[PDB]
Structure formats: C-alpha cells, structure tokens
Design an enzyme around this catalytic site. Structure first.
Site, short mmCIF file in Angstrom:
data_model
loop_
_atom_site.label_atom_id
_atom_site.label_comp_id
_atom_site.label_asym_id
_atom_site.label_seq_id
_atom_site.Cartn_x
_atom_site.Cartn_y
_atom_site.Cartn_z
N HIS A 94 -3.51 32.82 -7.70
CA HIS A 94 -4.14 31.77 -6.72
C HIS A 94 -2.72 31.09 -5.83
CE1 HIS A 94 -8.35 31.39 -7.87
NE2 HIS A 94 -7.87 31.72 -8.79
N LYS A 151 -7.60 18.31 3.33
CA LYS A 151 -7.23 19.22 2.54
C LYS A 151 -6.17 18.53 1.49
CE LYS A 151 -6.13 22.07 5.57
NZ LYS A 151 -6.44 23.57 5.18
N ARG A 152 -5.75 18.84 0.60
CA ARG A 152 -4.79 18.26 -0.46
C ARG A 152 -3.44 18.04 0.50
NH1 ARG A 152 -5.35 17.36 -5.86
NH2 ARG A 152 -3.07 16.46 -5.47
N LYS A 211 1.11 22.81 3.90
CA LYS A 211 -0.22 22.56 4.55
C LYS A 211 0.26 22.15 6.23
CE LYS A 211 -3.22 22.63 0.86
NZ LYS A 211 -4.22 23.65 0.86
N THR A 230 -10.49 27.78 1.70
CA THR A 230 -11.92 27.93 1.66
C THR A 230 -12.20 26.94 2.50
OG1 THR A 230 -11.77 26.55 -0.40
CG2 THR A 230 -11.81 28.77 -0.62
N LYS A 243 -15.73 26.84 5.21
CA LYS A 243 -16.84 25.96 5.41
C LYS A 243 -16.69 25.39 6.66
CE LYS A 243 -15.67 24.58 0.94
NZ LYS A 243 -15.45 23.34 -0.17
C1 LIG Z 1 -2.76 27.20 -7.31
C2 LIG Z 1 -3.72 26.93 -6.26
O1 LIG Z 1 -4.49 25.90 -6.53
N1 LIG Z 1 -4.32 27.72 -5.40
C3 LIG Z 1 -5.10 27.88 -4.36
O2 LIG Z 1 -6.34 28.37 -4.77
C4 LIG Z 1 -7.44 28.45 -3.71
C5 LIG Z 1 -8.49 29.09 -4.33
O3 LIG Z 1 -8.24 30.71 -4.52
C6 LIG Z 1 -6.82 28.98 -2.37
O4 LIG Z 1 -7.95 29.17 -1.36
C7 LIG Z 1 -5.82 28.18 -1.99
O5 LIG Z 1 -5.19 29.02 -0.56
C8 LIG Z 1 -4.67 27.98 -3.16
O6 LIG Z 1 -3.70 26.97 -2.48
#
Ligand SMILES: CC(=O)N[C@@H]1O[C@H](CO)[C@@H](O)[C@H](O)[C@H]1O
Ligand SMILES: O=C(NCC(O)N(CCO)C1CCCC1)c1cc2cc(Cl)ccc2[nH]1
Ligand SMILES: O=C(NCC(O)N(CCO)C1CCCC1)c1cc2cc(Cl)ccc2[nH]1
Ligand SMILES: Cc1ncc(COP(=O)(O)O)c(C=O)c1O
Ligand SMILES: Cc1ncc(COP(=O)(O)O)c(C=O)c1O
Ligand SMILES: CC(=O)N[C@@H]1O[C@H](CO)[C@@H](O)[C@H](O)[C@H]1O
Lengths: 804, 804
Positions: free
Chosen positions: B343, B534-535, B540, B642, B646
């Site tokens: 991820h 987002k976080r 980002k 993701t 949305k």
């Molecule tokens: C390590 C971690 O949290 N990875 C996160 O995973 C999501 C779900 O796959 C991705 O959409 C996102 O880009 C990514 O930053």
C-alpha cells in the site's frame, strides 16, 4: 407461565446470544435464562422508582465501600416467585438449571461480614418496601479467588466482569465529575477548590427485588473513568481508582489509592443524592437557599463503618462552598442527615489517615475537618474548663508524632446516631471506646443487632428446610421470622424430628458429592459435619480449632478402637494477601489435613478439608450441610458475627464463646441449647491484668503439649521441620488472643458435642430449639429498628400491580 | 412491517434500556432502534456461518491492523432493505430519525485509506456472497478525536466503547492465549519457546451484511486481557496491547508496543484459523499432520500491507513446532496460503524492525525468519553465482549498522501473490522497488486497483443523487456500478443536468448549515466548494493548496472588483501526534483562514475553513456537497487514493496530478474531463536527477514570492513573525515533494476550474461524464478481481428464504 418462559428463553438464546441449540454453550444458556428472568424485574423496577418520585417518601442511602452480593439469578427467581416455573421450563428444554446457575460469577465486592451485612440489608429494605438505595463502588476486581498450592494460599484476580454482567445497568446520563488534589482559594465569592485533577464517576444500577412484593430497589455502584500513546495509556491511572477491592478484613491499610476510593464513592454519592433532592421539586424549591431545610426529612445516609467518613466533610463542602449555606445551618442539616455504624474492635482496624496525605489529596476537606474539630473542642472547653486531657482524647486529630485524623471521631460528631452491631459490642463502644462522647451525648449511641436475610440464607440456600417449615407453620415466617417460634409445638413430634434430620441428611449428601469431586478425599456421610467458615484471622482462632483437630488425631492413634463419633472437619476462608500469620495458619491446616486424611489407622474416623475459595455462593452450599458451627473468637473480639446466625437458621448447633451475637443467640434459644465455653469478657480482662503466660498452659496440659511439640518439631512438615516456628513463637510469646487459655475448656466442650451427637433425638431436639429461636436474627428485624430509631422512616406493605 | 418495527422498538426501550417515553434519553432511543435493527441480522448471520460450515467453500481471511468502519446503523438498515420501514416506524413514534443516527460513535479503528479499504472490502465480499472474514484488533481507543484550539490541532481520546457497542458480540468460548518474550530451547524434540509471558486474546464478532442478499459475514476483532494491589493493577500492561490504534498514516514508528499489537493479531488470527480448519469435517483428518494438504485450498489470508507480516513466520511456527510438519512442506503450504498487498512506496512508511527488538520479544520468530532468509539467499546464489550485491539487495535482513528486518521482503517471499493498489503503483512496485524479485518471479506481481463501496459512499451518504440516478436508469447500478455508463444517454438532457445541479445544491445547503453552526463563518451557498479532505502529510501537499489560497487572497486585495468565481475552500484531516511539519501546516492553514475570513475587502468572495475531526461519518457529509476535489499528491507518492473515487462518484470534478488511481479515473472518464496538472512520474525523476533547487521557482514567479515572503515575514502571524520558519526551511531546502515545482501549473489549472464554473451547463456536463464513468471504482469490481485472480473463490449470488 412455563410455556411463555420457554418461549422467552429461546427468544433470548437466538436474538441475545446469537445461538441455536446445537451451537449454544452452557454460558449461553445461563445468559438466556438470566435475561428471561431479568425481563420480569423491569416493570416493577420502573414503577417502584416512579412511586418514590411521586410520593416522595424519605429515602435511605446505605453508603458502603462493600456489597458482598454473591449470585443474583436464583435470588431473583425466588423473590419473584419464578423458581419452580423456571425449574420446569429449563427441564423441559433438556437442561439442568443447577448447572446453568454455576456459570454466574459471584459479585464478590466485599471482604466478609461487613460487606455481606450491606447485601442482606438491601434485600430486607426492599422486602420491607423502603425507599432505600445502596451506594458503593463497582470494583472491576472483587475479593480475589483463592487457590491452594503446595498447602499455601495463592491469590488470583477475580475478573468477574470478563463476559458481561446482565444484572447491572449503565446509567450514562447520570455520570459525574470527582475532584482530587489541587489547591484552595478563599475568594470573596466563596472558597474555591481549583487546579484539581478530574475523574469521572459512571453509575451502574443493579435491581434489588423485595421478597414477593413488587418492590424493586436500586444498588448504584460507581466506576472511575478518565475525562500521545503514553497519554492515552495513562488514562489507566484514573480508572485504577475503582479497579480492585482492598482485600483487608478488620485491618486498616492507609494506602493513598484506598483514600481515593473512599472520596470517590462519597463525592459521586452525595452529589447524586443532592441532584435527586433538588429535582424532587420538594415543597417549594424556592431558589438559592432552595430550602435544604427539608433535606434531612427526605434524606438519611447510613455510614457503613468509617470508610465513607469523608461524606460528612463533603456534604459540608457542598452546602457551604457550592450551595452557599451558612456554616451553622450546613452543620445542623449534616448531623440530621448522617448516622454512623461502628463494626470494629481491634486497634489495627481503626482508620487513621495522616493529615499530610489528606492535605495533598483533599486540601479543602482537611480545612473543613479542622473547622469541625475547632468548633467541637471549643465546646468541650466551654463545658470542661479544667480538663485538658479530655481535649486530646476527643479531638479528631491525634497530634502525637505524625499527625492523624481519627475518622471514627469525625463520624461521631457528624452523625445524630451511632450504633454498634450487637448488645455486647454496642455497650463497649458507648461506655468504653467512646465514653467521652456518650456521656456528653447519651441518647446518641444505640445498638442494632445484626441479622441475615431469610430469603437468601434459608429459602434460597436450603429449600428443603424452608419447605418443611412451611408445611408445618405456613409461609408467613418468610416476612416475619419471629413466627418460627411456632415450631416449638413440634418439640416432642418424633416424625417431625425425623423429617428435620432427613433434610440435613439430604444437604450433607449433596455437599459430600461436591467435596469428593473437588478433593480426592472420601467423605463419611455418617460423620458429623464440623464447620468453621469465615475469613482467616487470629482473633477468629481457626488455630484453636486446628489444635483440637490434632488433639482428636492423637487420640485416634493412641486408641484405634475406642468409641468415637466420626467427624468431617471443614475449615475455610480467605486470608488477606499480606497477613503473614493467617497464611501460615492455612498451611498448618492443610498440613495437618494431609496427615489426618492419609493415616490408615484413622481412616474414615476423621477427615479434614480446607474449603477453598469460601465466598457467598459457596457459603450457601456448606452452611445447609453443617451439624456443628464453630464460632470461637476470643471473647470481646467478634463485634457480632453473622455466619453464626446462618448456621443457627439452617439446622446446625453452635459451639462458641460468649462473644458478639453468640450471646444473644444464647439468650434467644436458651444457653443450654448452645455449646458455650471459655473465657468471657471479664475473664479475658483479669488475664490481661495478671499477665498472659502461655507456657503455663503448655506445661500443665499434656494433650496440648503433644500437639505443640508435634507442630514445632516438624511432625506435620517432615521435609521442613521448622516451618511453623512463627506460629509457635506467636503462640508462646505474642498471642493477644489467648489460644492456649481457652484450649482446655474448648476441647472439653467438643467432647460434650460428640456425646450429644450419639443421641439423634436429643441432638435434633436441640436443633429444633435453635431454629425455632432464630427469628430475632432476620435482617428484617434489624432494619425495622434502624428505620424506627435512626432513619425515622416507615416500612410499606403494598404491591406494584401488573396486568388487569 | 412498520407496525412490528414500532412494537419491537418499544419492547427494547422497555426491556433493554429500562425506560419509558417520558424518561428516555436520545441515547436510549438510538439504542432501542439499534437493537430493533440488529435483531434482523441474527437469522441470516447464523445461517450464513452454518452454510460455510456445511458447504465448506474456500474461506478468505482479510488480516489487517485497521478497519475504518464508521457508523453501522444506517448501513445495516440499507443493506437489509429496512430503511424506509424503520424510517416510518421512528416517524410514527414521534422521533427524529436523523437525531437518533447522529448519536452513534464512528468505529474509527483506522487511520485513513488503508483502514477504509478494508471496510469497503468487507462490505463488497459480503455482497458478493464470499465466505470472507475480517480479522483485526478491537482497539479500546480508535483514531483520536480532533479539536482545534487557538488554530492548532488538539487530540482527545476516542472513548468509543464507553456506553457500549451493540454491534459487537463477545465470543468467550473462542478465547486464546498469545505468547511473548521467553526464550528458545533446542531440545531432543525440536525447538521449544519456553518461559513466555501470556496474554489472552478475546474475540468480538461484528456482523457484515451483504447488500440485499441474506449474506452476513463476520469481522472478528481481538482484545488483549491478562491471564497484591500493584499486581492486580499491573494487569493493565497486558491489556495495553489492544488499548490504542497507532495514529500514523504512511509513517513507520518502530515502537515495541506496536510490534506487540502486530504479533497479537497474527497469533490469535492464525490459531483461530487453524482451529476452524481442524473442525471443518474435511476429507478425514488423520492426526500429527492434520494433513493440512488441503489447507491452502480451504484458506486464503490476505496481508493488508506488512503490518501483519509476522503471520508468515507464525504459520511456519505452528506447522513446524506444533503440527510437526517438515519444513519444506510447511513452507509450501505457507506460500500458497498468503498473498501480500503493498500500500505504499514512501520510504518513511516502510516497516523495518531492528533484530534485537524481535529477538527479545519473538526469539522463535527471529530464528524462523533467519531460516527463511537463508534458504532464500542460497537459491539466489545458486542462480546468480557472480552477483554478490544482489544478495544484500534481496535479503530480509539489512546488516548495515543496526540490523533490521525488511518486512516487505518477508511478505514477498512468503506469498504467492503480491499486488499494488493502482496500475501506476503496481508497476513501480514490480519494476522498480522489487525488481530483483519480480524478474525472478514475474507472475507473482499483480495490480488490483482500489475501489469504494457504492452503498456507503452513494446510497447512504448521497440519497438524493442515488434517487436521481435510480429514477433514470433503474436500481441495478447498486450491485453493478458499471451500469452508470447508461447515464451517458442524458448528456444533452438540460432538465437532467438541472436536476443534477439541484441535488448538489441541496447537499451544499445542508452542509453549509453544518459549517455555520460549527464555525462562526458565514458561507456563500453560491460559492464553489473546493475541498481537500484526507490525512495531513507533506506528500499529500495540502501545503500547495494553502499557497494557492494565499495566491487567491492576494489577487482579491490587489483588485477588489475583478470578475471572480466565489469559493469556499475547505481543507480537513488529522495529523499524526508526532508529525511536526504536518502540525505546522495545519496552523498555517488556520492562520491563513483567520486573515482571509475576516478581511473586509474579500468578504463573501472567499472563505476558508479547516474541517475539524475529519473521519468517516464526516466524510459522508462533506463529500456529497463538494464541487471541486483536490487530489494533488506529488506524482508517484499516492499509491492509489480512494477519497478521489468518492468525490468522483458524488458529482464533484477532480483537480489533480497523474498519480495513483487519478490516472485510471482519467482513463475512464477521459482526460479532458479532469483537471490534470503538474509533473508526472518521469518529470519528477528528471528533476531529481538534475537536482531540485526550490529557490529557482521562488525567484521566477512573483505570485509565489509574495506568498512565501508573507508567510516567512509574519503576515499571517503578526504576534509571532517567525512561526513558520520551519515550513520555509523545508520548502526551500528539504522539500522532497517539490511543492514549488508544481505551483505554477497548479495555479494555472485552478484558474481553468473557475472558468468552467462560470458555465453551469458545461460544468455539470463534465460532472455527468465523471459520474457515468466511475463504475470501475466500485469495490465490488475490486473484490471480484481478487477472488478470481488471487483467492480463487466465487461470488455465490442469490438469497436464502428467511423464516417463512
Ligand atoms: C500505508 C498506507 O496507509 N497506504 C495507503 O493505502 C490506501 C489503500 O490502498 C491507498 O489508497 C493510499 O494511496 C495509501 O497512502
Ligand atoms: O445493560 C442492560 N441493557 C443493555 C444496555 O443498557 N446497553 C447500553 C449501556 O449504556 C448495551 C447496549 C449496547 C451494549 C451495552 C440492562 C438491562 C437491564 C434490566 C434490568 Cl431489570 C437490570 C439490569 C439491566 N441491565
Ligand atoms: O452483545 C450481544 N448480546 C449480549 C451478550 O452477548 N452478552 C454476553 C457477552 O459475553 C451480554 C449479557 C450480559 C452482559 C453482556 C450481541 C448480540 C448481537 C446480535 C447481532 Cl446480529 C450483532 C451483534 C450482537 N451483539
Ligand atoms: C462469604 C462470607 N464471608 C464472611 C461472612 C461473615 O461470617 P462471620 O460472621 O463468620 O465472620 C459471611 C457470612 C459470608 O457469607
Ligand atoms: C475519513 C477518511 N480518511 C481518509 C480517507 C482516504 O482518503 P485519501 O484517498 O484522500 O487519502 C478516506 C477515504 C476517508 O473516508
Ligand atoms: C470491620 C469489620 O469487618 N467488622 C465486622 O463487621 C461485621 C458486620 O457488622 C460483624 O458482624 C463482625 O463481627 C466484624 O468483625
């Protein structure tokens, strides 16, 4: 009915436990049954509390750090009149209700007598229809579970809430903040307690069903809750306040965490009590002063011992600092509100918190305590200009060296009533311990002899006896235990006596089954069940009992063929984790037992069992199967005792000293109907004056000598000969409970017991006189007295209607 | 029917909450409704699990340290097809359905995208009727609640379980022991892991309802529990393991407590999985080696990132040390069982535990890891005799200085499949990051583009849009999102476009109400809602957004009358407690906002809001009201994203870089229908080669210069001029995310957005093309691919008659 109950059970198994009959566990079945029964409490619980609001009767708040409740399932069914129907339903469902019941964790939120008394009181108050409330702490861990490893006591955490408690109801909307530490400022808008750390108090309500009367009272227990990773983890600190019950019985341990628990219950309780009052819309809620003059007529708070003593300075704080009432007025209302019950004797049990600790944790309360004391002493000085020492005697502060607060003194000056728990005890408290106070305030001190609820301790634990008695004299005795005197009519009724013995017989059989599946031992069902179950403590003297056990063993070895009444000696009870002598006494008993139970020559003549994990639910099992009840505390040490009452109510004969309620048991049933022995209070005094020289007895009584030498030389611990030197040393040079002093008279009394046991008709005739005279020991009688002479409230006989 | 639901609600309010309509709280009503709905899951939950037992289909176990579930009430009603009926019942009862739903706490057991993906997957797998199970940790505290004090982020403990979670079911009978520390013994009977400390793992099951199909899967979450006073209190230590969720998003924090959580989930999960395998009546289970031959055909375990990497050496430990299987066999079955999903390619995010720590906590696992590595390397050597450096590159151990374990390497060698979460990302993982492995095992690496569930992220959060679409093309799209392409038929339908805008209009109105009651600001409902939620993280780049906000502000001041599309700029998200730069960026945004929102000349032209406590339930509110979605991560940093999906599904236009799934969104809807800008992956590479000199841009773009100087000199923090020197310093000399590098292209793109916004028909025509092409982003599509190409399972599609 039976059909609807089965339907409900299945409904809960499905929707509540998410199981079906092929996948359900025993625990699931217990939960399904618990919920089925619980649903029957709701209607009446809601109506009862609504009734108290509508009619506004004076409420009673029993404030205690302990509530030794035991299991709830069976007790609820019985008081709801549901037992036989649930019995039938569960049977038709192909299950054993008795096995489901064993799943329930005991609510062991108590140490022993003190906590169990609170539990019995709640039941009695609900049965008497009083608007009563129990206020305590919801300990995450109650009195530890006791294991015996290599003969020694081993503690294990009592994780009773692990799988959920269906009998408790979280009351989120009533959460409250409690304050600690901080500092105080005496501003021009009142004194403010600031910079404090806050701990949330979350209340949990448990229903208390009255016996067959539609009344359902409440026991409200509080749990502590906190208002980067390390910070989150540190929330554990606040939550530690309601984490564990201090496992001490008759022993004061001045730990800061304990002080926090005490203030915790008190703060949440009083604030909740005031909130309820100010919401009652009582006669004219006129703002600001809002009356509060009627507070004492609507509220009664009973201090179960000095543990919640802080309640006094806390109410004053609320009245003065928050409600802005003048001191004189607050103090007046405060005394009229509180009543204090003393349950202690030993110097080591007295609560005496060092001022420094209280100053750090509760600065504002220390100030309020100093002011109470100041006003207290001024008057004594006013009344006794020339008696300086009287001042140091009556002060709430002991200045000598490290300064401490005498909590009992605080309770006495803040309450309008102070009571002991047995005539002999209340007299000592009034005329000796608190002589300086009683002379000044005679009418303040009273006696309220303890009692036990005949529901749990008769109808529940001994259905066989309850049935037998009902068949002969009706069911009225449940609510009026004095009615048992009617049983006197059957004194010469052989058939009845036979029936009485059969019931005991049946209980002994069931319990013997328990004993064998738990211990490798084989029980002689024909043997007299000699039982001593209670917390382990030197003043209780299970040590004296142990000496007699060894004495019996040595007689058997010396004459393997002499005529002997077979006995099964059972001794049980938990020892406080840090009570060294108590732990040694346990290992001694287990040691002796191993020798006794395995010595081929004694065989089935005598068996010794150390009953493990003695607790309420276990008490309900062993008591009904007992023939001889050991109540042998040194005269003047057992304030009252209550186990003694349970055994008496259940068909057992008592062997004991003239101590606590034993004296009133003798008064009620006639002294010759109890095996009384040993020194009485005046004798113990003479001995203390003359000086106790234990060796004296040792060298004068051969049977004792052999016993002691055996213990001291390693007869009961070969692989470790000097294991008990501590017991020996204490027994010869530091036994403040005169064990050797009562030995001879004790052993002589024991022989008498055996003689009577050989005469079944005479034994059961004495048993009947005991049962027939146990009526005064119902806690219903106790509460009536409290209500009439202390709380000034009135029992109510009604019934929450349901259907139409 | 509505009548039975009202009856059920009243029943629970009475028997479950112990209240009546005049005393019930809002919380009580929520609970009554939650229970009423919950009862509807039972029948199907039981039958579903029974079905998996009877038919024994291959099961899928999604193992993750996070599950960002959000609220459950509404999602359950919708999937069970009960929302209108319940909505009616609550209405007829005189209750506000909305107010009740808001009562529910989010189950925030996740940080962001990673955790939310697991949540969406559970929903899709249940809807596809797969025998899937989610395995995670039941954190007592989830992602912290975020407050903003004096412009700064403030964390508060997420005590989500305080009043009880009706959606979880304790499964006592499945409790298991987990081991820690201890040491390894090399005996005559294999290696033994002795002297360990034990922690109990108590499982809690939460139902996962498939959308309208009678399937109800399970999410099993584990909680740690301990197997005188201080000893009791110290039980807190074991329980600390499942106490809190580590609040880090894309950042590795090698704390020992975190390692304990990872092993905790893994140990309990694998043991529970094996237990279930053993009890599944499968082709005769000999003994010793329960054959386990068919284990891989009956079990699939997906490693959500490397967090549960220990699952690999743990299965080996069970197979070898306990099940006594030969190593070669165990390893074979192990690879066939596990599949690993990567991820992220961000360096600071990579898990690399120092060996010393693992040796101390998991000695036996370190041995197993060394053996896996040894056999791993031997082969490489066998295949590449003359490539030494290849060995250090592929080893699971990084020896350089302090030794560490490369967890991703471990996952790769222990799994039969490794996948990225977006084409661009999966390619980087396969051809760059793990080139040495993919060359050797081509077919191992795959891509599985992420997705979001159209239930929660459309039917639930945007009922208005869902209704509009249904009215035009039917309800089939819910289970087959590709059906949205049918909307292309309305491309020239002005009335439809008008209806589309009205829906957005309605969402913006409702959300604007939220914004005003929460923030003192006044929202221009006519303004374009520019949102970036987002976080908070440098990659980002909410920082880049902030620069544009300041850029817009400076334009307004310079020409207070120019033609300008009004905007409401919303930026929200939580920063990890210890992520310094992230926290500074938040204060910057709040600082800028205070200046912008209160500057009289800008007035309603532009408003900036830092959306506090961004979380799932809040996301469901802001997303539907968005016009412009900010997805501006530096090309190559956002594995997939993701949130982007949305916003696309909900009627918003996207402004972003060619990164993560943004690229596939462009592929699906056509690049001209998205506002793509900035450097692409190849450009970022060229820049890194040539060397990034940030000052370059600073001195060449006046608008940027003014922005930077203002930040650096204190224009946004007068009472503290050098507050942002850290941001400045990082922006000029240590910005590995090239913020200035994309600034110009970003601002130019933004202007284009505004132009299109002035043309309502053109804007909504682009919106329609986006919504009509979002079908591929349904997590249903994602799971099908996983099932078909990795787990080898089949979505059984149908419905099982309830109890008619
Ligand atoms: C390590 C971690 O949290 N990875 C996160 O995973 C999501 C779900 O796959 C991705 O959409 C996102 O880009 C990514 O930053
Ligand atoms: O606990 C009870 N109900 C559950 C409950 O109140 N609850 C919310 C507590 O705040 C649960 C629903 C979600 C999980 C916890 C409860 C009901 C009840 C009824 C009687 Cl007569 C006595 C005790 C009781 N406890
Ligand atoms: O928690 C539940 N029931 C209560 C329970 O299981 N329980 C025992 C837990 O071990 C209570 C009885 C005493 C207090 C706790 C529960 C039931 C249920 C049904 C669905 Cl469809 C989904 C989640 C669920 N949780
Ligand atoms: C478990 C338990 N402990 C202690 C007591 C108090 O007994 P005694 O009066 O014998 O100390 C009782 C009664 C009890 O049930
Ligand atoms: C609350 C929450 N946080 C984070 C994310 C992931 O979003 P993004 O892909 O924008 O990082 C989502 C989605 C979400 O619902
Ligand atoms: C401090 C304490 O535990 N006191 C105990 O209280 C009970 C209940 O009043 C008495 O019966 C008992 O004799 C006494 O030892």
């Amino acid at each position: 009915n039976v059909a609807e109950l089965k339907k409900s059970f299945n409904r809960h198994l499905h929707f509540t436990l998410v199981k079906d009959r092929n996948v359900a566990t025993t625990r699931d079945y217990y939960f399904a049954l618990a919920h089925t029964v619980r649903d029957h409490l709701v209607g009446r619980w809601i109506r009862t509390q609504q009734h108290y609001y509508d009619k506004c009767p004076k409420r009673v708040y029993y404030l205690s750090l302990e509530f030794y409740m035991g299991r709830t399932l069976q007790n609820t069914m019985i008081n709801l009149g549901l037992q036989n129907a649930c019995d039938e339903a569960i049977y038709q469902l192909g299950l054993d209700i008795e096995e489901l019941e064993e799943i329930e964790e005991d609510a062991g939120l108590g140490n022993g007598g003190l906590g169990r008394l609170a539990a019995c009181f709640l039941d009695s108050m609900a049965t008497l229809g009083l608007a009563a409330y129990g206020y305590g702490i919801r300990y995450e861990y109650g009195i530890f579970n006791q294991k015996i490893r290599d003969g020694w006591q081993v503690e294990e955490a009592d994780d009773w809430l692990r799988y959920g408690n269906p009998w408790e109801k979280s009351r989120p909307e009533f959460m409250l903040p409690v304050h600690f530490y901080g500092k105080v400022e005496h501003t021009n808008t009142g004194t403010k307690w600031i910079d404090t750390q806050v701990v949330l108090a979350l209340p949990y309500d448990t229903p208390v069903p009255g016996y067959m009367n539609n009344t359902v009272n409440t026991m409200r227990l509080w749990s502590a809750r906190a208002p980067y990773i390390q910070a989150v983890l540190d929330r554990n600190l606040a939550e530690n306040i309601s984490r564990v019950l201090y496992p001490n019985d008759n022993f004061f341990e001045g730990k800061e965490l304990r002080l926090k628990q005490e203030y915790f219950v008190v703060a949440a309780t009083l604030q909740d009590i005031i909130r309820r009052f100010k919401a009652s819309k009582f006669g004219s809620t006129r703002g600001a002063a809002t009356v509060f003059d009627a507070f004492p007529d609507q509220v009664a708070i009973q201090l179960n011992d000095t543990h919640p003593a802080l309640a006094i300075p806390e109410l004053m704080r609320i009245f003065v600092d928050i409600e802005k009432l003048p001191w004189s007025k607050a103090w007046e209302l405060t005394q009229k509100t509180f009543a204090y019950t003393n349950h202690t004797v030993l110097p080591e049990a007295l609560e005496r918190w060092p001022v420094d600790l209280v100053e750090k944790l509760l600065p504002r309360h220390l100030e309020i305590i100093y002011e109470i004391n100041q006003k207290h002493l001024d008057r004594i000085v006013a009344l006794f200009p020339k008696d300086v020492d009287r001042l140091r005697r009556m002060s709430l502060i002991e200045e000598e060296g490290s300064k401490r607060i005498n909590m009992a003194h605080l309770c006495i000056v803040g309450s309008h009533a102070v009571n002991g728990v047995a005539k002999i005890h209340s007299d000592i408290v009034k005329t000796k311990v608190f002589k300086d106070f009683s002379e000044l305030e005679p009418d303040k001190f009273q006696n309220k002899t303890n009692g036990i609820t005949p529901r749990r301790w008769l109808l529940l634990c001994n259905p066989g006896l309850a049935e037998l008695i009902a068949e002969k004299i009706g069911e009225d005795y449940v609510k009026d235990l004095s009615q048992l005197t009617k049983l006197h009519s059957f004194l010469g009724d052989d058939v009845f006596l036979r029936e009485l013995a059969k019931v005991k017989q049946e209980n002994k059989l069931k319990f013997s089954q328990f004993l064998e599946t738990e211990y490798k031992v084989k029980i002689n069902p024909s043997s007299m069940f000699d039982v001593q179950v209670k917390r382990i403590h030197e003043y209780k003297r299970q040590l004296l009992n142990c000496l007699h056990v060894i004495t019996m063993y040595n007689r058997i070895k010396k004459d393997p063929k002499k005529l002997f009444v077979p006995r099964t000696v059972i001794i049980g009870g938990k020892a406080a984790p840090g009570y060294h002598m108590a732990k040694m006494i346990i290992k001694l008993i287990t040691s002796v037992a191993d020798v006794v139970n395995n010595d081929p020559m004694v065989g089935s003549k005598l068996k010794v069992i150390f009953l493990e994990n003695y607790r309420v639910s276990l008490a309900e099992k062993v008591i009904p199967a007992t023939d001889l009840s050991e109540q042998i505390s040194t005269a003047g040490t057992e304030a009252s005792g209550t186990g003694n009452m349970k055994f008496m109510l259940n068909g057992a004969l008592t062997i004991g000293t003239m101590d606590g309620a034993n004296v009133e048991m003798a008064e009620e049933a006639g002294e010759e109907n109890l095996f009384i022995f040993g020194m009485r209070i005046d004798d113990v005094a003479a001995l203390d004056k003359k000086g106790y020289e234990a060796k004296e007895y040792y060298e004068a009584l051969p049977e004792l000598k052999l016993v002691i030498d055996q213990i001291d030389n390693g007869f009961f611990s070969p692989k470790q000969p000097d294991l008990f030197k501590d017991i020996i040393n204490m027994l010869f040079y530091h036994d403040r409970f005169k064990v050797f002093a009562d030995y001879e008279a004790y052993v002589k009394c024991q022989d008498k017991v055996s003689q009577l046991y050989m005469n079944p008709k005479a034994w059961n005739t004495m048993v009947l006189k005991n049962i027939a005279a146990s009526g005064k020991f119902s806690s219903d009688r106790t509460i009536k007295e409290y209500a009439q002479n202390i709380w000034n409230v009135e029992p109510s006989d009604l019934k929450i209607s349901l259907s139409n």
